[PDB]
Amino acid sequence: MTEPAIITNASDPAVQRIIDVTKHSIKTTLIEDTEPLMECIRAGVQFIEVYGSSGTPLDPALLDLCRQREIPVRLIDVSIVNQLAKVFGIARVPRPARLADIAERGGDVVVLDGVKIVGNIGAIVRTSLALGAAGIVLVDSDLATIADRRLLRASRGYVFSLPVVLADREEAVSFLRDNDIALMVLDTDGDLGVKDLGDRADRMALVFGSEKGGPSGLFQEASAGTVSIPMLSSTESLNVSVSVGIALHERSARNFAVRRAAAQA
Amino acid sequence: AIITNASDPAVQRIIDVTKHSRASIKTTLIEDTEPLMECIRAGVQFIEVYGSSGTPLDPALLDLCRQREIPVRLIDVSIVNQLFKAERKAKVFGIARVPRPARLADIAERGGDVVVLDGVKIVGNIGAIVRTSLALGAAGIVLVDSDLATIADRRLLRASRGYVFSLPVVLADREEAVSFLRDNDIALMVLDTDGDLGVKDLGDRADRMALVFGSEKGGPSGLFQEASAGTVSIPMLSSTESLNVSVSVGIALHERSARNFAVRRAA
Ligand SMILES: C[S@@+](CC[C@H](N)C(=O)[O-])C[C@H]1O[C@@H](n2cnc3c(N)ncnc32)[C@H](O)[C@@H]1O
Numbered sequence: 001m002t003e004p005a006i007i008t009n010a011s012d013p014a015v016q017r018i019i020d021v022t023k024h025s026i027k028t029t030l031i032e033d034t035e036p037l038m039e040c041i042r043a044g045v046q047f048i049e050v051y052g053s054s055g056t057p058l059d060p061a062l063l064d065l066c067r068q069r070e071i072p073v074r075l076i077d078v079s080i081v082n083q084l085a086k087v088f089g090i091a092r093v094p095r096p097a098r099l100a101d102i103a104e105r106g107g108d109v110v111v112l113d114g115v116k117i118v119g120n121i122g123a124i125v126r127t128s129l130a131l132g133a134a135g136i137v138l139v140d141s142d143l144a145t146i147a148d149r150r151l152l153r154a155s156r157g158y159v160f161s162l163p164v165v166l167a168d169r170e171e172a173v174s175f176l177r178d179n180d181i182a183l184m185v186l187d188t189d190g191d192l193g194v195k196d197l198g199d200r201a202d203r204m205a206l207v208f209g210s211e212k213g214g215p216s217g218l219f220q221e222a223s224a225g226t227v228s229i230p231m232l233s234s235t236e237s238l239n240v241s242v243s244v245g246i247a248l249h250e251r252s253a254r255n256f257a258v259r260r261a262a263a264q265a
Numbered sequence: 266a267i268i269t270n271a272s273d274p275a276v277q278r279i280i281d282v283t284k285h286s287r288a289s290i291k292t293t294l295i296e297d298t299e300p301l302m303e304c305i306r307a308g309v310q311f312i313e314v315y316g317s318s319g320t321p322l323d324p325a326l327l328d329l330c331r332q333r334e335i336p337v338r339l340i341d342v343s344i345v346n347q348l349f350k351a352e353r354k355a356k357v358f359g360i361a362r363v364p365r366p367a368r369l370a371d372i373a374e375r376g377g378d379v380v381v382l383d384g385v386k387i388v389g390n391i392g393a394i395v396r397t398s399l400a401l402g403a404a405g406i407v408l409v410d411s412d413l414a415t416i417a418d419r420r421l422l423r424a425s426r427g428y429v430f431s432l433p434v435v436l437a438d439r440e441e442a443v444s445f446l447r448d449n450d451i452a453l454m455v456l457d458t459d460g461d462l463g464v465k466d467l468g469d470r471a472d473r474m475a476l477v478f479g480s481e482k483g484g485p486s487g488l489f490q491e492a493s494a495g496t497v498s499i500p501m502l503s504s505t506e507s508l509n510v511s512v513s514v515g516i517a518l519h520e521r522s523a524r525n526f527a528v529r530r531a532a
């Protein structure tokens with residue numbers, strides 16, 4: 001065979017076993033696929049090493065980036081990599097963002113209240129980043145950490161690109177209060193049409209509830225108003241991730257302005 | 266509501282039989298209270314609805330079934346179990362006649378915008394788009410390269426929360442879809458980054474259009490590109506970013522909803 005020397009072959013090299021180690025559960029994660037790896041490196045996550053399966057090209061952009069940052073790359077014979085991904089990285093889990101980080105960053109706050117489906121949560125993380133939100137407060141998500149590998153996968157690596165914070169319903173409302181961030185609650189039958197959302201000049205929190213429940217009462221009490229997305233009939237409802245896209249799309253001139261000024265500061 | 270206390274009425278065996286052998290073509294199972302109610306409103310013809318002896322049967326459902334002449338029976342939980350084997354549960358469900366499949370013509374007839382998915386395969390995404398598309402007033406949905414054999418597929422049934430029968434949803438080949446749009450004078454636009462047009466201007470067109478969305482693997486395909494009247498981009502902080510496809514559909518349709526709601530309300 002004279003199989004290329006560089007390819008990690010033994011199932012028990014330190015690195016193989018180190019990779020088993022995260023899998024079998026340091027403060028380090030596995031991050032998969034070319035794009036998520038590139039967003040994570042961009043967001044400043046620190047990597048220990050990037051791996052690809054022998055037999056397939058590593059993305060030139062990723063390689064470049066990996067030489068750009070001083071991130072070692074190596075290949076592992078394809079057979080083993082079936083310990084899962086054609087490309088993946090071991091990264092150090094950054095320290096959990098906190099509510100303060102969100103206020104400081106400027107711009108709209110996305111609050112989820114009892115959203116628990118991780119595919120929904122991940123899609124929302126990605127939308128919130130892309131549409132210029134300051135950050136995301138997760139209340140009642142049943143997540144232990146944002147570094148959960150289901151959420152990393154679902155967010156396509158966006159979970160470390162803006163502050164995403166686990167908080168309790170109480171501390172969340174409290175935080176918005178003493179930062180003077182008016183919140184509005186998304187709901188069917190809300191008084192403000194979502195198309196009027198861009199009119200309000202200052203940053204705001206938008207609160208979203210789960211499929212079933214909606215948002216609880218704590219938020220419904222501090223609210224400066226309710227916002228509705230017009231639908232065919234008043235009994236229908238959108239997926240929560242879809243609702244988030246629409247509301248943040250309406251806020252985008254506002255949030256883009258904030259993102260652009262921060263980029264120049 | 267009388268009880269299938271146990272044993273096996275022909276009706277238990279028909280629940281069994283309605284899985285992957287010629288027979289499941291023309292009758293299916295629909296699960297859960299809300300999806301069942303959506304299906305009934307949508308005119309799907311039920312043979313019978315079942316509940317587990319155990320958790321109780323939603324009164325709105327009972328009355329709906331009562332208003333229709335749909336028999337409702339409970340099944341001892343011991344039988345409901347097994348039945349639903351290699352997988353999940355379902356404590357309420359119905360057996361139903363599958364509607365004759367919608368075709369493209371039905372979409373064109375209804376009026377209003379056409380949602381075209383090109384290569385979207387993740388059924389969770391398809392199913393969420395079906396709900397979005399109904400709620401926001403679309404005429405219908407053309408599914409191209411969807412990897413489904415039937416819109417009645419049970420995964421889509423669930424993923425759609427039973428909305429798959431509430432507006433015309435049609436499987437088609439790419440060329441067939443493109444040829445259909447062409448001879449019905451429905452201009453198509455492709456949703457993609459770096460387009461000549463902004464999503465916020467989607468509202469400016471008074472007449473209906475088809476909106477083509479690609480998957481995550483790599484946007485819409487050449488044939489759609491060739492027939493395209495333009496490319497519509499939702500602005501983002503940077504062009505390395507992209508949205509989940511179902512989110513994209515919600516934003517594009519929301520911009521078109523004033524236009525579509527008018528068609529839905531008129532005729
Ligand atoms: C009614 S639940 C069900 C959504 C869907 N079943 C899912 O998987 O998320 C949707 C949530 O998104 C928000 N939402 C849904 N439709 C909305 C609308 N038309 N206007 C404002 N908010 C809406 C609400 O906050 C609600 O808590």
Ligand SMILES: C[S@@+](CC[C@H](N)C(=O)[O-])C[C@H]1O[C@@H](n2cnc3c(N)ncnc32)[C@H](O)[C@@H]1O
Binds near residue numbers: 481
């Ligand atoms: C990036 S791909 C798939 C994203 C995600 N992986 C998913 O779950 O679908 C998104 C598709 O939706 C439409 N789309 C997504 N983001 C868009 C944007 N920012 N502007 C215009 N269209 C967009 C395009 O058709 C594109 O091909």
